[PDB]
């Protein structure tokens, strides 16, 4: 029936508790979605080649060239935190919970409305929007994960974060195969090193279409489509962070002489000459036992050739690393590599009353200290005669290849059978919730984009389209653009994401850090006088935990 509703709008969050300190977090999110008809109905193969920008020596990092297939379909992506939780709910989860699991995911399209536009062309402009009761919305749930997986969070193109603001879906595309070469240069190189695009090798060509791969459901103004509950198989996420680095693993040394009064200068003292200390160290050619040299079970965190760019068939990319700097929490200028930087707009946090195309940005300084401080590292000759002479220590200040601003730490890697490192923390609201595991024989230990990674398979994507509303002058033999009636669809979307979380327990005499409203952050969680809203980033691993 045209005049009957097919679904209920619900954006509530429910915390049903259970025995043993577990809570089932069911987060319902609903949105009003606005979809126009695609610019064209044809699958386009398009190439980007920013030769002008990259031809300038030393700008190789700015390479954007690639190949993609532009489809007539739009993607509905709810794989971002803000789609599901409001600031208060996040406060609750992060302050009261210790671990978080992923359980299930549903979504449905209900109350489909299709409308057509007529413009009068009269000297005083005017137009009319008319209903099209027989028009249809094409819906295709890629339950088998046949299409390439394209998580919209990386581009900040997911659904919106406010229930009361309608949201649009994103034009869907996927990568083609391009062979591209770009020899790096500097401001000072002669001429122009090779910046060439080669094309496609026939053995890597994959032209997917939704129509030929997924069932298509033709929803009229009175139909509905429900995906069906999916159940996850991810590993747990932790809402607590580790402070213990290698220097803090194990039993401290006994202090044979202790302070006798309170004072900034009243330090303690181990009390035994260093070459006379009992203990165990891996450095077999010295008798000095020191906090820098005493054995530890393993390595917390690892060093990587940070800002390494590595070239493959498709061009240079930045070597991703798991965690960022240590101690950067006290200075934003030292965010450096590892810690992500999010750029986003008014659907996803930026003060909705801001003009212009500049996006709000934040860098997410993590709470966990599985990091490194390169300026303090040093490699010294094996002899270990101390104090070390100029020739027997490589310092972070020394040149590599004669480049005064490239030190050994930039080409350094300390990852081994001993590396203990943690998973990435969730980033509210612009972070990703889940990701698909690569279909490679040997798989990565973690993803840097999402906390939850999927073992076997996980939820299929949803693609939407407006059916061809042909005029009476259609002619499939015509080479011109197909003449369509301008049509657009507004359909409601409701999703349900179920989480399982554990309630934390107080383990220490002292209070721990929590997210709290204060006279500084106050106006970030209430609308402006003219009605503008924003969502500021929030931490997720405030509570510390014991690594060892």
């Amino acid at each position, epitope marked *: 029936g045209v005049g009957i509703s097919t679904g209920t709008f619900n954006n509530q969050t429910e915390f049903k508790f259970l025995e043993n300190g577990w809570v089932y977090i069911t987060a319902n999110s609903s949105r009003l979605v606005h979809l126009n008809m695609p610019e064209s109905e044809n699958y386009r193969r398009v190439v980007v080649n920013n030769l002008d920008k990259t031809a300038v020596n030393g700008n190789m990092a700015l390479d954007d060239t690639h190949a993609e297939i532009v489809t007539p379909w739009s993607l509905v992506d709810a794989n971002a935190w803000g789609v599901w939780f409001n600031p208060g709910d996040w406060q609750l989860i992060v302050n009261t919970m210790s671990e978080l699991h992923l359980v299930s995911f549903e979504q449905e399209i209900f109350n489909v409305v299709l409308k057509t536009v007529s413009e009068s062309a009269t000297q005083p402009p005017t137009k009319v929007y008319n209903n099209d009761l027989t028009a249809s919305l094409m819906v295709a749930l890629d339950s088998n994960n046949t299409m390439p997986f394209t998580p919209a969070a990386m581009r900040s193109e997911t659904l919106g974060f406010y229930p009361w603001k309608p949201t649009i879906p994103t034009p869907w595309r996927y990568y083609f195969q391009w062979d591209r070469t770009l020899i790096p240069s500097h401001t000072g190189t002669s001429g122009t090193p090779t910046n060439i695009y080669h094309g496609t090798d026939p053995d890597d060509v994959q032209f997917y279409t939704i129509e030929n791969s997924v069932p298509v459901h033709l929803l009229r103004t009175g139909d509905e489509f429900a995906t069906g509950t999916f159940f996850f198989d991810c590993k747990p996420c932790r809402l607590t962070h580790t402070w213990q680095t290698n220097r803090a693993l194990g039993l401290p040394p006994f202090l044979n002489s202790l302070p006798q009064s*309170e*004072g*900034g*200068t009243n*330090f303690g003292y181990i009390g035994v000459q260093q070459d006379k200390r009992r203990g165990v160290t891996q450095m077999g050619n010295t008798n000095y036992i020191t906090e820098a040299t005493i054995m530890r079970p393993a390595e917390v965190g690892y060093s990587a050739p940070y800002y390494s760019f590595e070239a493959s068939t498709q061009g240079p990319f930045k070597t991703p690393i798991a965690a960022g700097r240590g101690g950067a929490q*006290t*200075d934003e200028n030292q965010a450096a590599d590892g810690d992500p930087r999010y750029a986003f707009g008014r659907q996803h946090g930026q003060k909705t009353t801001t003009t212009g195309e500049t996006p709000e940005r934040f860098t997410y300084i993590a709470h966990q200290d599985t990091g490194r401080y390169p300026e303090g590292d040093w490699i010294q000759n094996i002899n270990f005669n101390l104090p070390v002479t100029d020739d027997n220590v490589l310092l972070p200040t020394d040149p590599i290849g004669g480049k005064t601003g490239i030190n050994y730490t930039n080409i350094f890697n300390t990852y081994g059978p001993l590396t203990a490192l943690n998973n990435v923390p969730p980033v509210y609201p612009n972070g990703q919730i889940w990701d698909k595991e690569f279909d490679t024989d040997l798989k990565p230990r973690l993803h840097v984009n999402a906390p939850f990674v999927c073992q076997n398979n996980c939820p299929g994507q949803l693609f939407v389209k407006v059916a061809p509303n042909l005029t009476n002058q259609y002619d499939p033999d015509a080479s011109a653009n197909m003449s369509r009636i301008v049509t657009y669809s507004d359909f409601w979307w409701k999703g349900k994401l179920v989480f399982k979380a554990k309630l934390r327990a107080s383990h220490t005499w002292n209070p721990i850090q929590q997210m709290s409203i204060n*006279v500084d952050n106050q106006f970030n969680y209430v609308p402006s006088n003219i009605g503008g809203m924003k969502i500021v980033y929030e931490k997720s691993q405030l509570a510390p935990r014991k690594l060892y």
Partner: antibody
Amino acid sequence: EVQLVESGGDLVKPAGSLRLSCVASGFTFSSYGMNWVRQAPGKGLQWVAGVNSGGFTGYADAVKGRFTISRDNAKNTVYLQMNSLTAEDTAVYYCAKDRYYCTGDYCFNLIAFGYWGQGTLVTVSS
Amino acid sequence: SVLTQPTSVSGSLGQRVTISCSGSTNNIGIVGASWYQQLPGKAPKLLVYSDGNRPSGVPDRFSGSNSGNSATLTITGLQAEDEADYYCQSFDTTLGAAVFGGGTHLTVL
């Protein structure tokens, strides 16, 4: 860039008290210690006091037990209550901030650096 | 405690000049000197850190050195604008207090 401002210096009678104020902007006031340094007309420098983020305070013997320094982290403001002033305290007073972030009791109040403010003059006489 | 300094020093335009400061194991021998410059009637501005580095915008002319219980500052390419009073600074590890030197006046000829 780091900016500091000071106020409260004035001519005052011996004994009694006087209260200086220094304000800051451009840097994370919480993570850095704040110090006062003074210089008499045409004479050398002399560190007065410093206060780390946690409320722990330090003083030089010339004032230890006479002055009391403090912070208001919510306003990037530091205060120096100068009780029991004497003629020898006549000097110009400057507000400084250490280079390296630091907090707690064991934290050196001032090692090397500070974008010293314009300063405030103080005279004790009657 | 206090750091010793020379009373005054002189140098000709375009020539190099040196200034010295002396301390003890607990002030200079542990934490290096930091050199400050004070213009007439103005608040002092630092020249060289104990780290050996200079703040942003400080001319390359200045540079510092340290040896045992003493430190030293030098100016290369002395200029007329460099005529100012100078002070060494350190930290007495025993008293936990910043120790400033006696000051020195540099004359440009």
